[PDB]
Amino acid sequence: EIETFYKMLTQRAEIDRAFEEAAGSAETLSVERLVTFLQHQQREEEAGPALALSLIERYEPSETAKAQRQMTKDGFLMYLLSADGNAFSLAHRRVYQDMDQPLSHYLVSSSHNTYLLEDQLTGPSSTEAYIRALCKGCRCLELDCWDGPNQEPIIYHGYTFTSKILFCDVLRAIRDYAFKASPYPVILSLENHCSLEQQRVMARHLRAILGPILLDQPLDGVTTSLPSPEQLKGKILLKGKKLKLVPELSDMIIYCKSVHFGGFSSPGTSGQAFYEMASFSESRALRLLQESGNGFVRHNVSCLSRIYPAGWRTDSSNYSPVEMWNGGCQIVALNFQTPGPEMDVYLGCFQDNGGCGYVLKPAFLRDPNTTFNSRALTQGPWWRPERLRVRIISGQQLPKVNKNKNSIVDPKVIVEIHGVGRDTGSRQTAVITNNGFNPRWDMEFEFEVTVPDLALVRFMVEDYDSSSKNDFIGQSTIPWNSLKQGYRHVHLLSKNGDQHPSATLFVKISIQD
Length: 513
What we know:
The chain has 13 helices and 19 strands. By secondary structure, it is an alpha/beta fold. It has 3 domains: about 10-95, Recoverin, domain 1, CATH 1.10.238.10; about 95-380, Phosphatidylinositol (PI) phosphodiesterase (TIM Barrel, Alpha-Beta Barrel), CATH 3.20.20.190; about 385-513, Sandwich (Immunoglobulin-like), CATH 2.60.40.150. This is 1-phosphatidylinositol 4,5-bisphosphate phosphodiesterase delta-1. Keywords: Calcium, Glycoprotein, Hydrolase, Lipid degradation, Lipid metabolism, Metal-binding, Phosphoprotein, Repeat, Transducer.
């Protein structure tokens, strides 16, 4: 029973079945059978002996089978639990997109009032807050600058009781972490409330601290468009007001002049310059989208738009980014300190493209002459309906997010489609009582998605509670085009975006036109 225990516990029928079905009679999977699996089941494009073999070399435990090119059930399982078996495309976990287009052509990971660790009114601010966001791949950060004691500019939330920090200290932290997660440009939004003197100080700190990382002159060339992430690789650019404002600072604002929203220019040629950036609150944005969906979209092809959370969100709660993305909005600022589905989707999106923080917009959101409007859908390249079938098979080692004794979680799984309104959907499985180790649901859902290029699939596991609100156990959000088919494991993340070493969901995904 000693091995029986381990062997009986550690046993997964769904895995057995799958191996069986793949290997048939054989106690092993030969390269040729693996290949067929990779193709027929996993739907790999690069399906072929080369892939199969690499998988075996990489995952097969048995020296015999390895040497003999074959895969045992164990190697099968190891593959399935690996980065290669991950429902989130391993290939997309490296920079793989065109990083040569104007910035306005990418979605950019953006943080709101980055300095804050908690609420907007009286919580603390910390350089730590900036370090975290940068470590989560954030590209656009916000600094709200005010005059401080001893001529040292400080940062905090204007007109509130939030704790304070030094502008210089923030700059050092940014300097130290700006590119730890990505090489692409970081943008610093300066909200300047400093006296001219302290403004001068800011400028000095900027130059002294960022030094050469700082972008202080236009790029030789780059005349009719914003540079590309590649062109600005390794640089930090300031965004703010350009000539109350000393030249020292104003002269540093190159490609992102803060401007008040003029309007959409189609009734003419131009409006805001490509080097001009407007901002919209959550509410205004929604309205503009509701009324002028296509203008906003078209506007966003050549211009960067920044969106920020409604003022009432003093709790640092977040809005859904998806709706802004659907309009081509790129600097969709969220409160990075706040766990929730909003940040879950946000970081799911930005895990794509190797998590570099710049994610290329779909082509139709890069066409100045587009008639797209996620709100009034018509025929177009964006319209490409797909049928998705997700079978929630089993769960493995779901963590306990509650009381001292493993009260044996009673898990259930929710699956959501986020995208254009038409596509948004959600479905939930039944609850398995008292089992986080290896619940088994075997439930399937099907969803029709018309605009897959803007869609994301989210898996969320809750702990059902009759009396109270169910506790969140784990989650994972996958951008549509990074969704892998066949049998895969979804690796659950915590509220804070941390990877749960052993908590997974075992599923089978199928997408068909």
